[PDB]
Every structure is written in structure tokens, then in C-alpha cells.
Amino acid sequence: HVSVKPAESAAGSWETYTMKVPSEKNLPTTKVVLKMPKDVEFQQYEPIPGWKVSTQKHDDKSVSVTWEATDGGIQEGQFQQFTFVAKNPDKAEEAAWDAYQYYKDGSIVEFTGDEDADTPHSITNITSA
Ligand SMILES: [Cu+2]
């Protein structure tokens, strides 16, 4: 389960988010893609050794951030944390973090489900502020 913390944050602020990516298969995780929630504006990322980071804007003006491994990736028994800054929406809402975790066999785990789903996305509760 890919979790973006803090799981609660104030509307209208810049927040320092940390995405934690645990290994869930005995296979290297080689890439992670995080869709920015609607109304969350990505600002900057923090460099991590062994990873190259890039942003991509799509037709619907949605933004995804990609961390790609350059030196083995996340191996069995490991997790890695990826920190970035984003501007929160200006109203209270549920910001859902759709994450895509790429393993070395070419498989992809889509953490995009709801509460009851097998691969759920994590959520930041954006509160009034
Ligand atoms: Cu989890």
C-alpha cells in the first residue's frame, strides 16, 4: 500500500508530502507514478540518490510525477520514501493519491481503488483553513 502523508492537511497551504512505497513483491520496484489529486498543484520534489524525477502534464490538465530507478530500485524487504511539496486546494475535500508501482517483471500495481478495494489509493483529508 502506497501512502502519501500527512493524511490530514489544511486547505490553502503548501504542504510537504512524503510518499512511502513498500516492496510488496520479492522483485525490484523500478518506477512509481503518482497522479496529483485534482486541485492539488505540484511544486517541487526532493532529489533521492538512485532515482530520476520528472513531471508530465496531460490533456485534461492533470499532472503526474514519475520516480524512475537508476540503481536497482526498491528491493525485497525495503521501502523508500519520496518527499515533495504541493499546494493544497482552497476548499476542504478528500485528496486521493492514485499511485502506480512498476515492478521489474513489467507488472504494474494500480493503487487506485476505494476503501474496500484490494489496491486502494491513500487519502489526505484536506480540512478547512
Ligand atoms: Cu499501507
Q: How far is the CA of 121 from the centre of ligand 1 (A)?
A: 9
- 128: which 3 cell numbers? 478547512
Resolution of this model in Å is 2.0
All domains in the chain, ordered by first residue:
3-127 (2.60.40.2230)
Q: How far is the CA of 1 from the centre of ligand 1 (A)?
A: 4
Q: Please state, in angstroms and as integers, the Cα–Cα distance from residue 85 to each residue in 36, 65, 76, 120, following that order.
A: 11, 12, 28, 23
Q: Which experiment gave this structure?
A: X-ray
Known binding-site residues for Cu(2+) equal: 1, 24
State how beta strands 79-87 and 14-22 pair.
Answer: antiparallel
Known binding-site residues equal: 1, 24
Q: Which residues have a Cβ under 8 Å from the Cβ of 20 and sit 6 or more positions away? A: 2, 3, 4, 5, 79, 80, 81
